[PDB]
């Protein structure tokens, strides 16, 4: 490929990204509840107030 | 599929004449190659 | 250790007897098993040392298993 | 006022019944009765954002406020009407006391802070973990009123310091020592978030350790 | 004889960091039309006796790393150097310039959570400048990294691909800066 | 609401007055003050270790290394109605050593 | 390479097109008028297409021919040193570890990580750009 | 105290005795270092251990 | 003049003394110059700075557990009831001037001095420089670190404040009077009764400015008087023995570059002393028995202990009317870690037979099994520091306290066996990485399309080739390969001048031909000393 070193930091990013997000379950409060299409207001800090949500967005 | 299995770590220890989209099956079957010429439109 | 499995075995301490690592698993994982007795009135832990302790009575014992059946040096 | 009473009432309906109740008694397993919790309840939970909560798990946090001060008013003054309790207190104008409410003697406030309040809080009001999920918060961001009314009325698992328990001039001197924590200046430095010994010990390893090593990189040879 | 791989990545992923600044000019668009009639509102009071100067030396800096990229293709690694030298700090200036503005914005009651126009104009000009900086630190990497060996064609194209990504930031902020304080 | 939820121990029965009951403020672990009282859950949280005790359940270890109850205080009033202390612990109080019970 | 050129120039004449109909069609008997945010996307993503396909046009009318451009060009005519590709590197993990550093730090609003994880981006991503770069260690 | 006119620069009354002291120090040791690296002559030196 | 006045010194030094063969054979001692060997040393300057930063302190510290009412300037503990050693410990960080940086450096100095002997302890255990002739050595660090353990956990201690003084009550007291049969013996004998008591405090402030520090500064003389008389260690490398030195004499290059060290390692914890807040007292209150706050943490060098008492199960007996409580584990897990360290060189000959004299150190890679145990231990050390600090890490990052009690105990088992199998692999991976640049070569990282379609990579031999052209195997000498074709000169360099302006070409291509002269004739030095010998 073009840029050898890049396609193994797109990988990377793409393991650690997943983890990132998937780890809101190990929060008491638990992982994002409000759909992948995260629809607003339902996202705003004052209806998904948990680190779940902020973890998801990350 | 002209490559081995797997592919070298650079990919092709040679390569062949790439005349179409299907270079591996003119590299295999070379009698094809006028039929698929002569055949290809309907 | 074959200096074809570890390319500098003469040059340091590069083999661990395998009954070490079977007898350190087993016993690991009774370990895991042992903290069940404690105070805690939860389960959820109980499931997590149970299965971490199948995983590895699981490990151990392919491992027992492929070594002696010879499929593994 | 009758005008306020409704205009609490109107406000409740539309945000609160699902899990408090028409009457406000309490929906079960979803909301508790909010009967004598009083206006200052009213006034700590709404006007720190904790109400309305939107799912039950270990804790409900703080958040951005749904209502604003006339609101949340009404709101307590609705409550208030069924049950009674405690009330936030005013000043002279009848708004929400402020700076009336930092006492004058801080000595006394971390006395007593440290007595009641640090086990849960800490030191210097940085919170603090509890047993499966909660935590007490970080005490920097509530105003003096927020502060006096969270000790009122107990909220979540916080103990309940009723003003017989803690008169009001200690609860001053209390909030005095809160507020003066919170806005002081680290002394030594950077403050390092206020913990000690782990962000201590953290910034020995990834920045005077790193550095001395890097340090001694440069000055050695490799090989 | 055939495309330099390098300039043709770096132009690919410019092309879908303007999409990232679409998402923002989305933004500002969707709360101008919801305005009601006063854009900025009060008490915003933008000034441009202080945003046109800094404009015109992010311009001026992209001049100045043109000339860098003559030097650079001519193989003359000091004149690279220098004209890099001056954009990095005539780009810093721009930095230190919006910063000031901030500074002033914020005194006089124009903030992130104040209002719906803090919002969009603090979003949209901050995220350029975290772009401004991002090319800061980029010219910093490139100046340290043709003092470590011989300046070769690659080093050459190294310097052509940051002053891509300084051009496409300099050309962004015209295009902010004419849809902020002239079509407000 | 929640004294239909409380178990009493064997020998203490008597040392609560009504709805109030004195432990030891001093955990039972290693002698820390375990004073983190969260009322809803009835838990007594040490802050040193983590230990946790069941105020409901005679202050009970639940979590943690402690392995030994908090020792209770019996409380009753006076004359004048003050909280006065009913007589002594009826174990020692505070860490173990070799020589306890 | 015209016909990558060409292919870029395609997706921006239907792009351009999707982009003055809609903002005609939504501010014409729409509610509200120009419909903001999908007018300024479809703007920005003919600006995409057109970004790339006038860098490929410049570049395909400056270099004559090359044998993967030609349509009876022999494999000999590739003959020669390609370019660099770097053989290996443990620098892509360290930057994405960074970067998650820096995400997590963010999720949690937790500033001195933000701190943390944008110093390490900024040496992990020195320690890419230099790795073909640094000389020999001196004494 | 708390509020007092002198508080801020109080607060930084060790903060710069911390910059000033360890920038001096720090800086010697800098030069110092440097001295060695492009002054002093380059060497190697072998000595038998006798052990 | 200044001359003349050097050699009637030198002559009046060496009529008296006769000191000149002795300070010769000094000043030619030969000091191998790789970075990992300027480890030792920061702990070293770490341990004088502690010793001048002290010696200031001990003109302001009045020790005193004696009550007392606070009548300084501190307005926010003013008429509040503390020990003459908390009062006194205020004083010095508001009412002497300079008090509080002269503090903060102390303290700063004591983690450095800490981590800079764990660091430095990694380097010794996983080259292999415990070896025989140096067990004993190995011994006297060992001792010299838990010592620095004890002498920093009692210095924190003395200012009698709140967090201190809970950590007294609970490792000092808790623990020691569980001990079995001894315990409460043991307990009496050192507080003088009951805690807290009126002797601990002045008891401590013995132990630590006078007594502790005595034995860390003879047991480190010792050491270094070991390390000088055996001859350091090192790497295998280009004329390298087991039977010589090579590397710088002490006059001047070592003796510059270590002094040199030595003032930036005090600039560094100058510069944190006066950057960084660490154990600001007077927000923590003094000691009271009946308060405590969230977030009881030691510092982080006692910080397993504690980790390991938070995560050892509430496991305990009661034989025959007596009481062997949870602590008691906690005491033995510290003596057995303790015992395990002291003793590793003579478990490791013992365990590989392998019991010759050894001045060549290993490359981490090479030894995969002390490679993988070494990790393990770190491992297991990291996830006992990190339960320590469980609360806060609950608080920050959104975890149940009662989830990090368990990731902890089923992790204190798990992570050490998962870190050994990852590191025994990485090692032997990193053998077989070299083993492939040995074959084949540096790869170039050029890739060329042969006429006939193939693609090949350009290697650079590192040594003869064949007649074909491919390089002919090279044995592996325990040393590193090169794996960088820029780390081998191929970048060259850039051009001689300013950063902004070039030099007259006259002077660059002298300078180049110069430098490139010099590093041939190294090379050739080092090359025919290996020839010879
Ligand atoms: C809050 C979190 C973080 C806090 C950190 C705070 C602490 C700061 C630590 C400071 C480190 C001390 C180093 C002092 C040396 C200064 C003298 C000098 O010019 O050295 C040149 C020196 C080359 O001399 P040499 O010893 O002959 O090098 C051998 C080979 O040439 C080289 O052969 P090689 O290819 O094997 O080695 C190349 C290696 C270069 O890196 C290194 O070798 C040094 C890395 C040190 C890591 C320490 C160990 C920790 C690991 C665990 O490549 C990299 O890894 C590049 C890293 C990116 C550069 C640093 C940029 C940081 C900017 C921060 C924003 O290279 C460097 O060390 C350059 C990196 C440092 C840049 C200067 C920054 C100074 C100011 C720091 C704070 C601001
Ligand atoms: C994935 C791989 C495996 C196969 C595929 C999938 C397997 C997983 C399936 C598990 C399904 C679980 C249920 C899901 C729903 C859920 O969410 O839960 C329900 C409820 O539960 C609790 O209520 C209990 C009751 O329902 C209430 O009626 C009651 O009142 C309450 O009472 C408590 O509380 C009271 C006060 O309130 C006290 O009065 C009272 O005394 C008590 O304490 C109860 O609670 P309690 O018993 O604590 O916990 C128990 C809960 C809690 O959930 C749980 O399953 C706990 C989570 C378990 C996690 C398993 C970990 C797996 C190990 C790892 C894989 C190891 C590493 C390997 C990795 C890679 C390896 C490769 C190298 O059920 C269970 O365990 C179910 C039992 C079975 C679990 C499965 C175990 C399998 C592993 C064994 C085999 C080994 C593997 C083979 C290897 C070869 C409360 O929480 C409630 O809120 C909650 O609502
Ligand atoms: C060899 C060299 C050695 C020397 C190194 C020296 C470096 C340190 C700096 C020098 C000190 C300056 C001189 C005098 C001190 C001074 O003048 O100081 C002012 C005040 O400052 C703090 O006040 C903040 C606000 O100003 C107050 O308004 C607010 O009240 C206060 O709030 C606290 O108190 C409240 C109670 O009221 C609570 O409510 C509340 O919650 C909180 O606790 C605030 O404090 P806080 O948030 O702590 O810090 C936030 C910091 C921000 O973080 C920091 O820079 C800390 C950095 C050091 C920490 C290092 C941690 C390392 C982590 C590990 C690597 C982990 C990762 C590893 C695992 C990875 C896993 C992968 C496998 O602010 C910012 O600039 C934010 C914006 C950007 C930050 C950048 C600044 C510098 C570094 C930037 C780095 C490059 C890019 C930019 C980054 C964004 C408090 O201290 C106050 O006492 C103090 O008064
Ligand atoms: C025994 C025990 C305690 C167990 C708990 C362990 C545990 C689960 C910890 C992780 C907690 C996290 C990170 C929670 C969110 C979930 C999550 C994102 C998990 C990881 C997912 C994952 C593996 C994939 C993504 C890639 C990746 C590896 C992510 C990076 C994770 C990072 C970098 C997080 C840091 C981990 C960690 C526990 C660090 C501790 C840092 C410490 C001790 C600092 C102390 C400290 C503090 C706390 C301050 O407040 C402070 C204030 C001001 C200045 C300084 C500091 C400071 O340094
Ligand atoms: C109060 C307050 C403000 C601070 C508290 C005081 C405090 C904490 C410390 C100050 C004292 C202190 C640690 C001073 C450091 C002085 C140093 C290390 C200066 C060196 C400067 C320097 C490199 C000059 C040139 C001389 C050279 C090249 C080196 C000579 C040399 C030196 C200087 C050594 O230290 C040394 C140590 C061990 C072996 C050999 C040597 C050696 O040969
Ligand atoms: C990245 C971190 C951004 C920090 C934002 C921040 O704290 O700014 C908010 C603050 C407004 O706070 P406010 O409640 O209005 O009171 C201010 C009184 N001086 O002050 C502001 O309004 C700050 C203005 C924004 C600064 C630029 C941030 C760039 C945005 C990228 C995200
Ligand atoms: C542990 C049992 C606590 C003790 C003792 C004290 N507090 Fe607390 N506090 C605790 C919790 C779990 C919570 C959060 C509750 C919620 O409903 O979300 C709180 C909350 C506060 C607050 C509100 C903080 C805000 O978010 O800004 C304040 C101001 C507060 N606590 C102060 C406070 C004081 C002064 C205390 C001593 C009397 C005190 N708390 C005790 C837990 C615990
Ligand atoms: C106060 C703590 C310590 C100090 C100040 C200290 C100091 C030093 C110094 C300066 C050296 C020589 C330079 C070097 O290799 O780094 C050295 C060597 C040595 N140290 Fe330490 N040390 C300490 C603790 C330890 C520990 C914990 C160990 C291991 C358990 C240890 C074992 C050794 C050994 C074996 C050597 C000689 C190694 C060799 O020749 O290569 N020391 N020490
Ligand atoms: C191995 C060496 C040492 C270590 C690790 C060490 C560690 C510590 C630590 C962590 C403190 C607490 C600092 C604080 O206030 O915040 C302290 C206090 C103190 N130390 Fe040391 N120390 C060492 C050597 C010495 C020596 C030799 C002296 C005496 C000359 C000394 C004198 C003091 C005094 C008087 C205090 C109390 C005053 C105070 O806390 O500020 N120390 N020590
Ligand atoms: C340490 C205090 C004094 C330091 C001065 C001593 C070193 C210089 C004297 C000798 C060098 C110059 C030539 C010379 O005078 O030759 C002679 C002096 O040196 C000697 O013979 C003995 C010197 C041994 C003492 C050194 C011990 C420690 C000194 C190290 C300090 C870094 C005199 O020359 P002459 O007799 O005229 O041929
Ligand atoms: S002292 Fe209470 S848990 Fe240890």
Redesign the pocket.
Known sequence: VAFPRLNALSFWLFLFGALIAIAGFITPGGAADFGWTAYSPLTDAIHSPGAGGDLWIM | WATSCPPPRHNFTELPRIRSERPAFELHYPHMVERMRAEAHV | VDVEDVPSAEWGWSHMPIGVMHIGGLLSAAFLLVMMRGNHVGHVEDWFLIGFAAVIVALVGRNWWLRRRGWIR | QSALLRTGKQLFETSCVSCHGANLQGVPDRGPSLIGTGEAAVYFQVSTGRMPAMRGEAQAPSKPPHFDESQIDALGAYVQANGGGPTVPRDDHGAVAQESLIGGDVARGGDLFRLNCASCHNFTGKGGALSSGKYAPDLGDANPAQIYTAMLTGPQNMPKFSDRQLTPDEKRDIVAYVRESAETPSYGGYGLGGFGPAPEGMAMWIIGMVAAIGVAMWIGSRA | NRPNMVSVGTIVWLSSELMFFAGLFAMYFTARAQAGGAWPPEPTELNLALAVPVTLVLIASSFTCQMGVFAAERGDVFGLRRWYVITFLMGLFFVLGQGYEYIHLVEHGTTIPGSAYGSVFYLATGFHGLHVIGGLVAFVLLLARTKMSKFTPAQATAAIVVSYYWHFVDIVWIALFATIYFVR | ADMHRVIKRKGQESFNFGELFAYTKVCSHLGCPSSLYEQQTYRILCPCHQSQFDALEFAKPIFGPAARALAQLPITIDEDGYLVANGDFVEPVGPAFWERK | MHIEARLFEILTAFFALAAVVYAVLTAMFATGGVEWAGTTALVLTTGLTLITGTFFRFVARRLDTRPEDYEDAEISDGAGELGFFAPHSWWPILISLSFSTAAVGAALWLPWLIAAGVAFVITSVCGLVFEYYWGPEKH | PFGSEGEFLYSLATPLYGLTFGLSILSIGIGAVLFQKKFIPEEISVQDRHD | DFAKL??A???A??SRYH??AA?RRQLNKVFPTHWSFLLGEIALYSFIILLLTGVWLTLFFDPSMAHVTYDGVYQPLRGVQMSRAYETALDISFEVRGGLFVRQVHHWAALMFAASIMVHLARIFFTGAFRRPREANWVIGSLLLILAMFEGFFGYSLPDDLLSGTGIRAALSGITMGIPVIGTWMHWALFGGDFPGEILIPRLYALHILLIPGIILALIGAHLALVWFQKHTQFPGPGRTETNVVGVRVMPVFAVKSGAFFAMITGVLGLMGGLLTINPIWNLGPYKPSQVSAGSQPDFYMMWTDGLIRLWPAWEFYPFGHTIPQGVWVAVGMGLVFALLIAYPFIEKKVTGDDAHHNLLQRPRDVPVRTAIGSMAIALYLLLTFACMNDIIALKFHISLNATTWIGRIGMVVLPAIVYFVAYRWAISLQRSDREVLEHGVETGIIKRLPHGAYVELHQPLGPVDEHGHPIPLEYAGAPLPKRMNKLGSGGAPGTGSFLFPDPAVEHEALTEAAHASEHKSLTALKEHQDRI
Do not use: R
């Open positions: 050097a050699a010194q030198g002559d030094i060496d000191p000149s300070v």
